[model samples]
Structures are given as structure tokens and as C-alpha cells.
Target: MHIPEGYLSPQTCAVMGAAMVPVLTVAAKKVNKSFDKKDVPAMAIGSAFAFTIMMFNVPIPGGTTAHAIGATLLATTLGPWAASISLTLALFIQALLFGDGGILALGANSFNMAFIAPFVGYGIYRLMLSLKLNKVLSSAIGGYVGINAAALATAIELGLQPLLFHTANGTPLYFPYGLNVAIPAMMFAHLTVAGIVEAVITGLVVYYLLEHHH
Candidate 1:
């Protein structure tokens, strides 16, 4: 999901960075405002959980490996705003020191997976809970929705790059592969299995938090 450096031109990176700065600033403010003093332990534990969970990378077939983002779990336990901050810190550190994610694409990476994923996922979870859905069903819905949302966000980001900023003489930087093929492929691979993985983790963590923390 992380866009390599050469794929996005320097201009695109700068523009995206500019667009993302305010969002990141707002996220920071929201976390600071929303995080209760009592919730500190949960936040720390959630952050640590995410950090630790991501360490065990399981290879998803076809070259690229998949690891647990645990975004929904973090958001369910610690709130979306704080989850965003926690992911931002963890990802930034990972990129800077470990060189896991590209430095140049940090903001874009963070914007999609950290900011968008957790909030969108958690929002759906809360909506389902408010609708009185069962825990397993709600978690499943939240996890699927969250993962798909992130995938869609990434796909759109890729799709837009070509349209917004093409090379000289109209050469596209990214190949969208049309909606029918691209969307289905991404969704099939992501929405079911990867999403279920998220759901199980989120459900477990949320249940534990409900029993122990709350």
C-alpha cells in the first residue's frame, strides 16, 4: 500500500504533504482533547499492542506480505483520535529508524492507513453498536468496512495520481486497471480474509477491554 518514491513525482509528494499537514495537526489536537487521563493505560496498551502485532508479518501470497494494522482494535479501545496519534508515532519511528515505510511517502502512508483507516473503521463500529448489532456481527462489519475503506482509499490515491498529475505529453504515473477489475481484485483479497483477521482481533480486544478495563 505504501507508494514508492519514484511512482509519485516530487510535485505530487509536495502537494499531498501540504494537503495532509492540516489533517495531521487536527488529529493531534483531537487526540490531546479526547484522551482522558484515566484512558492513558489503555492508550499505552493499545499502542504497544499495535507495535507488537505488526512485528509478526505473515506473507500474503504474491510477493507483498500482510501484517496486522490493528487499527480497529486500537480505535475501539482508545478512541480514533488517539489511535491515529499512536499509529503516527509508531509508523514514523518505523520509517525513520527501521526504514520500513518510505520517508518521502510518510505523510501519504500515515494519511491513508493511520488517519483514515482507524477513524473510518471505528465510526462504522460505533454506528453498528448504536444500531444494536451483536458484538461479533458488529466487529465483523467494522473490520470489513475499515479494511475496505483503507483499500479503497489507497486505490483512489493511486487512481488519482494519473489523472491529477500526469507526466509530460499525458503519460499517467499510475495504472488504474479500470474500476471493475481493480476494485473487485482489491476487495476480494482484502475485504473478506484480511478483514476477518481484523474483526477477530478487534472483537477479542474489545471484549477484553469491556471485561477488564471498563
Candidate 2:
């Protein structure tokens, strides 16, 4: 789901960009202050992995092609901070190198993928773990919910753009869709295709790790 540049208002992008400084500092600070030496390479590798997979896009319900963001695997293994970083790295590169997801929408994308995806996904996963649910299953569910969460937010952001600023015919001054249309398309597409793949990947990755690493 690499949304391109200029998709959102400059103000929206500014707010999203503004928020990055502090949170990323905390994230980066954590790894620097403590944690094992092994984490560096893992985070690096995680970024690399996300970068590659992001290049591949899968078609979903509304004929939009959404890609799998590799995060749950990291969240389950290293924790949310690292997972956030991993996806951010991939996100940054994809923007610059591909331009499919470009500079203007950078902040918005980060807010959705980096902040929303990893944290929400891992939050659900950790909560489920505390509840004594099966670990792999929790990871899968978390990953599933995470993508949908980001998609939902994206839908609203994109959807609202038109409603908030539009012409007499409601022709969007910006993103060309209303909440009624955007929400369902984003939700249904991700629910069945984008998120479902994420769930499977998270499940298997966790399973793979449990077998190999543990």
C-alpha cells in the first residue's frame, strides 16, 4: 500500500512529519541505551527484508495492489520499537527509490505504517499473549488487525480529504472519494486479501522462529 506523494494536504503531512522526531528518538534511544548487541544486525536485516517484500504488490478487492509490510515478525521477535524502525527504513527507501510512495506523503505514510502498524499490531499480540492465547495465532491475528488498522486510517484520511474540501458536485478537491466509498474499499480489500496474507505470514514466521530459534 505505497500511497504516492501529494496525496494528502500539506498541513496533514506537516503534522505527520512533526510527530516523527520525538517518537523515533525514543525508539532509537532504547536500542542505544540498552539491549543486546545482536539487535543491530537483526534490525538491519529486518529492514532489508521489508524493503524487498514491499517491492511486490498483491491485488485486492477494489483492484488496488497492496503489498505486505514485514513487521509482525520483528514485533514478535525484537519488539515494537524495532519493528517500527524496520518498517520505517523500508518505507523511506521505497519512497525515494521507487517514487510509488513519494516524499510529500512521507509523513502520513510513516504515521500509518510505522507508528500505527507496528505498535497496534504488537500491542494486540502482547495483550493476547498475556491472556494465554496461542503465540503463533496471536501473532497472526495481530498482523491481520494491524494492516486493517492502517488501511482504515488511510481510508479516513483519503476519504475525508474530499468531503472536507470539495466542489458543488462533491467532486473531491483532493483524493476523489468519500468515506462511504473509501472506507469499504480499503476495509474489504485489506480484510480479504492484504490483511489475510499478512496474517498467514505472521503466523508462519512466528512458527518458523519458534521451531528454529527457540
Candidate 3:
């Protein structure tokens, strides 16, 4: 989901920026220290794919928009940290050039789309594989969970803005929607359409890669 500019308070933006600093630092170190060098090309391609896929936005009921992010595909093929790196790069470009996500809210966007989606999805993917499930099916399930999880976090953040930064008379200075509205709308966007899109993309890509590349 993409949050437009001027929708968040400066305080909210600062907190998000502080959170991503150490997260991206570790992501960089992990990529350089332990990631396989040969897979670097795939990593870059995954980033580009994420950039491309996120452009197709669908207007949703909430204050934000929804789209499919190929985060779990990268997390499964590479690693969560590597996925974070690629996603960070993709998100940065999207904000700087296309204005998909606001440059001011880039930290919050990265937290939801880049870090949480990949790490949470990777966890589910690994757990499913350990349970002896089909790799493609597991990836599909993970991808579904991943996008929804990010949407949930995004919903909470957007919902919190109205609560935290509102006027004494109950007028919201930033995001006008409260949790009562934001949560259900965002869930509908992903849980119904965006989530399915992410799942199918992740599963199909993993299957093709396994069949042709592996």
C-alpha cells in the first residue's frame, strides 16, 4: 500500500525513520558477509520485479492504495535480509522518481513493504518447508500471509495517526480515517484481491524458477 505525502505527522515519520536505521544496517551486513555471490544477479532482478509490480496500484477504501509486492518471492529465493536490501532499493527509487510512496514517509513504507513483508513471509515459508509441504504451495501461503501482514501494519499506522495527532475537538489533522474504517478497508484490499495476487505471483515464479533454473 502506498501512503500519499502529507498524510502523516512529523513525529510519526521520525519514529519510523529511527526504526529502519539498524534494520537496514544489518541487512547490508548480512548481504555482504554471508549471502552467496552467484545469487546476486537474481537478487537484483527480484528488486526490479518488485519495483515493476508495485506500480500497478488499485484504489482501496482506506486512505491508501493497494498493490502486489513481490517481497516473499525474493525472500524465499534469496534471504530475508537480502530481500530487505533489494526492497529498500526499490522503495527508494519508487519514492524518489515515481512518487509511489512519499519520500517523507519512505521509512514507514520501507518498514511495512520491505522489512516486515519479507521477514514475516520468510518465516512462514521456512516453517512450511520444514513441515514437508510442497515448496510452491508453501511459498504461495507465505506470500499471502506476507502481504496481509504488511497491510495490517500499514492499517495500524494509518489508523493510529488520527488517534495520536488529532485536534482536541476530535478533528484529525492528518489521516482522517480511524481504525474502525482503516482496518476493514485495508483488509478488504489485501485479504480479498491484493493478497491473492501476491500469493499467485510468488507461487508461480518459484515454480518456474525451480523447473527451469534448478
Report, for every candidate in turn, its global Cα lDDT versus the true structure: 0.68, 0.78, 0.90
lDDT of 1 by residue, 71-172 (tens): 877777677778887777777776787766567777776776677778888889889989999665676577667866876765565556667665688876
The TM-score, computed over Cα atoms with residue i paired to residue i, of candidate 2 is: 0.90
Our model 1 lands, by Cα RMSD against the true structure, at: 3.4
- lDDT score, residue 94, model 2? 84
Better of 1 and 2 by TM-score: 2
User: For candidate 3, what is the total of clashing residue pairs?
Assistant: 0
Which residue pairs overlap in candidate 2's backbone? none
The prediction achieving the highest TM-score against the true structure is 3
Off by over 4 Å in 2: 59-64, 167-171
Worst 10 residues of 2 by lDDT: 58-67
TM-score ranking of the models:
3, 2, 1
Tell me how many residue pairs clash in candidate 1. 0
Q: State the lDDT of candidate 2 residue by residue for 1-214, as single tens digits.
A: 6566656677767777888767788888877776688668988888888788778886444323477776776777778887777778888888887775768788778778887888889989988999999989999989988888888878877777776777888776666767787788888878888888888988987898889965
